[PDB]
Amino acid sequence: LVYSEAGPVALWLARVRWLVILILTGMVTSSILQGFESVLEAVTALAFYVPVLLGTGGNTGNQSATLIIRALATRDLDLRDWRRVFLKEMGVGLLLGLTLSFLLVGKVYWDGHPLLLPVVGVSLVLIVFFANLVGAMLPFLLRRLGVDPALVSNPLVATLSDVTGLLIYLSVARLLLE
């Protein structure tokens, strides 16, 4: 589609379907949170860190994904190299997790919620770790399924990290505060 020649109505028609699919899939997060209503009610400040946790996961995943998409498209990597990449990214994700978690724990202490220092600290490490792997592996999976990663990698990694991020954080919270 040519942007400069497309009217508002035309742009809406070309954009809406992808957004509808994403928000329908995104509604899952609201159901997840409802299933943890007990823990959310128990500790008020638990909800304060959801956007930065899910957002950091998304940032990490889309960073590693972009690196992989480029590496494959430039033939620096091949589809057969996914295992060696996986093993290497386990280390990178762990190192990134520890670094970012160290900072966020500082914020939690600043905000004055010492009860949440362990749950937030552990959760972000796990979230960065898994989001980094999802980001590194998705371009391989997409390519093998016939669709190039460049077109749809961003919203997929963002949605998956949101779902998996909520599940990790709230589960860690339920085990440590109950």
Please give the annotated binding residues, written as ranges: 5, 34, 37, 41, 113, 148, 158, 162
Q: Please give the Cα distance from 42 to 11 (Å, whole number).
A: 45
Q: Is 63 in the site for its own copies (CB under 8 A)?
A: yes
Bind-site residues for Mn(2+): 5, 34, 37, 41, 113
Bind-site residues for Ca(2+): 5, 41
CB atoms closer than 10 angstroms to residue 46 = 21
Distances (CA, A) of 3 to 6, 15, 28: 5, 12, 33
Residue 102 structure tokens = 């160290």
How many residues interact with ligand OLA (rule CB under 6 A)?
Answer: 7
User: Which is nearer to ligand OLA, 108 or 128 (by Cβ)?
Assistant: 128
Rg of the Cα trace of the chain?
A: 19
Q: Is 19 in the site for its own copies (CB under 8 A)?
A: yes
Q: How many CA atoms lie within 13 A of 158 on its CB side?
A: 10
Q: Is 34 in the site for its own copies (CB under 8 A)?
A: yes
User: Which is nearer to ligand OLA, 88 or 144 (by Cβ)?
Assistant: 144
Interface mask toward ligand OLA for 40-79; x: CB under 6 A: ---------------------------------------x
Q: Are 68 and 85 in contact (CB under 8 A)?
A: yes
